[PDB]
Amino acid sequence: QDPXKXX
């Protein structure tokens, strides 16, 4: 759920 990274 973290922008650019993922989740």
Side-chain angles (χ1 to χ4, degrees):
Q1 307 289 6
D2 304 336
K5 296 186 306 190

